[PDB]
Amino acid sequence: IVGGYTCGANTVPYQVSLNSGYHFCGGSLINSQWVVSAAHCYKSGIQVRLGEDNINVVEGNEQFISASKSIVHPSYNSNTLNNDIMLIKLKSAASLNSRVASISLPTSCASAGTQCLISGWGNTKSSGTSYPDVLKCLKAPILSDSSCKSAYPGQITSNMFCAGYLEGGKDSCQGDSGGPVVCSGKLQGIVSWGSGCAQKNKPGVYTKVCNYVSWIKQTIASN
Ligand SMILES: NC(=[NH2+])NCCC[C@H](N)C(=O)O
Ligand SMILES: [Ca+2]
Numbered sequence: 001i002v003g004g005y006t007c008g009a010n011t012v013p014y015q016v017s018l019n020s021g022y023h024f025c026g027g028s029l030i031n032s033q034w035v036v037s038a039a040h041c042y043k044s045g046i047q048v049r050l051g052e053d054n055i056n057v058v059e060g061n062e063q064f065i066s067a068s069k070s071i072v073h074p075s076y077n078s079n080t081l082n083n084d085i086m087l088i089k090l091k092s093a094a095s096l097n098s099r100v101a102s103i104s105l106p107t108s109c110a111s112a113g114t115q116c117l118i119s120g121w122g123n124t125k126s127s128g129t130s131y132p133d134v135l136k137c138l139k140a141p142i143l144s145d146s147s148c149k150s151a152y153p154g155q156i157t158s159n160m161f162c163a164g165y166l167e168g169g170k171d172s173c174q175g176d177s178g179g180p181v182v183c184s185g186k187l188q189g190i191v192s193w194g195s196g197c198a199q200k201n202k203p204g205v206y207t208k209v210c211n212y213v214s215w216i217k218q219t220i221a222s223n
């Protein structure tokens with residue numbers, strides 16, 4: 001997160017860190033056994049870490065659970081990042097508490113204008129590199145589909161939306177990949193891609209979770 005703020009420990013109980021020896025991606029808990037993330041974060045040997053603030057310090061609220069299974073969207077295109085969504089099932093079910101909690105799936109698509117909260121352990125600098133140990137948060141509006149396509153000609157499908165600031169300064173960034181965009185207590189987005197971070201006229205691009213609710217629910221019902 002560039003230009004964000006320190007969330008506070010466990011103030012985002014649905015934020016998970018994907019760890020293969022190191023945090024590499026964010027993710028969102030949607031029930032005790034399942035995480036939603038970005039297809040482009042797929043690798044094997046994933047450990048899901050819940051209850052995290054500082055990812056380099058054991059602080060007392062962690063649950064570390066190995067993934068049993070990852071499932072990339074049947075139609076994921078790694079070139080265009082179309083359908084950048086993936087599900088991860090835990091080997092055992094998490095203990096849900098006040099600091100480890102699912103976020104609801106949307107019952108409907110959120111609109112341009114809607115204020116949202118984006119979070120992750122990504123780079124905090126727009127030029128240069130600087131990874132924080134504790135969780136960062138960003139309040140950002142969903143932008144119009146027209147300004148989103150203007151800003152990224154020929155690259156925005158119906159499975160993507162922009163959120164943030166055309167003036168730049170504030171954004172998701174590398175290492176936030178796969179993590180949440182929550183709007184009014186529903187998960188509307190997954191941190192997907194963008195051109196650089198926090199650049200003028202180059203806002204973050206997020207997978208549009210509302211489009212995927214059938215697939216998610218159908219998938220969790222049979223795995
Ligand atoms: N145009 C942008 N600055 N987009 C934000 C880039 C963040 C991107 N989701 C990543 O983690 O790599
Ligand atoms: Ca920790």
Ligand SMILES: [Cl-]
Nearest residue numbers: 004005006007
């Ligand atoms: Cl701060």
Ligand SMILES: [Cl-]
Nearest residue numbers: 060061062063
């Ligand atoms: Cl615990």
Ligand SMILES: [Cl-]
Nearest residue numbers: 144145146147
């Ligand atoms: Cl529009």
